[PDB]
Amino acid sequence: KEHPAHERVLQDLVMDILRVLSTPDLEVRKKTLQLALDLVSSRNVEELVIVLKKEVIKTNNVSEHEDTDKYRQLLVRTLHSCSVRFPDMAANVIPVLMEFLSDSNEAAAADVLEFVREAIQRFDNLRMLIVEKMLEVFHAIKSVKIYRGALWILGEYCSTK
C-alpha cells in the first residue's frame, strides 16, 4: 500500500474480490473490511455503497448469523469512518431504518455512538426526518433500549412545538 503512488483502480477492483466474501469466513472477511476501508477517498464509494446496501440486503436474507454478525459491527465501524470524512447520503437513512429492525444492544451502542456524534455534527436536516422516522420507529416499538433512547432524544428536543 506503501506504493503510496497508490493507483485509483486497484482500490476499485476490491469489490470484485469482495464479492467472493459472500462465501463467508468472517475472520477473513474482517481482514478485508479493514483493508477495504482504506482506499476510499470518499469515492469509489457509491458504487460500493450501493453494493453495501446490496450487502445489506444480503445481510437480511433469512440469516442465522453467528459470524457475520460480527462482521456487521465491524462493517459499521469501517463504515463509520468514511462518513466522517464524507458527505454521505440516503444510504445512511437506511441504517437508521435497519437499526430499527434489529434487536441487540451493541448496535444501540453504535447508534448511540451516532447519537453522540451526530449531536456534534449537526448540519441537521436529515436528523429531523430521521427523528420523524424514529418517531415512527419508536411508536412502532418498546424495550429498555428504546426506553433509554427516548431519554436522550427527549433530552435533545426542538420543534413541531
Partner: protein, 112 residues
C-alpha cells in the same frame, strides 16, 4: 461495619433502602472524611443508579454541611463530574439544577 461489609456483602436492593435513610442523616453525625470516603465508594460501583444515590443523600447533607463542608461542598461537585449521557445528564442536570437556584435557596426548596 455496614459500609465495609455491604461492600462485599453486595445486593443493590439494600443499598436503596439504606441510601434513602442515610440520605436524610448526614452531618448531624459527623466524621466527614470517612463518610465521604465511603460515599465515594458507594458511587464507585457502576450503575448510574448506584452512583446516583450518593448525590441524592447528599442534598440533605450538603445543605447542612459539616466540620469542614460548605466551601469544599461547593468545590466537590466540580471535582467529581460525569458523562455517559443520561449519566452525563445526571451530573449536568444536578448541576444545571444547581445552576438554576442560588445554591442556598436551592437547598431549601429541594430538601423539602
Amino acid at each position: 461495619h455496614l459500609c465495609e461489609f455491604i461492600e462485599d456483602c453486595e445486593f443493590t436492593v439494600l443499598a436503596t433502602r439504606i441510601l434513602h435513610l442515610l440520605g436524610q442523616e448526614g452531618p448531624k453525625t459527623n466524621n466527614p472524611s470517612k463518610y465521604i470516603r465511603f460515599i465515594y465508594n458507594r458511587v464507585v460501583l457502576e450503575h448510574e443508579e448506584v452512583r446516583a444515590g450518593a448525590v441524592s443523600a447528599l442534598a440533605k447533607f450538603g445543605a447542612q454541611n459539616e466540620e469542614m463542608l460548605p466551601s469544599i461542598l461547593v468545590l466537590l461537585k466540580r471535582c467529581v463530574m460525569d458523562d455517559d449521557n443520561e449519566v452525563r445528564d445526571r451530573a449536568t442536570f444536578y448541576l444545571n439544577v444547581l445552576e438554576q437556584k442560588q445554591k442556598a435557596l436551592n437547598a431549601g426548596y429541594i430538601l423539602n
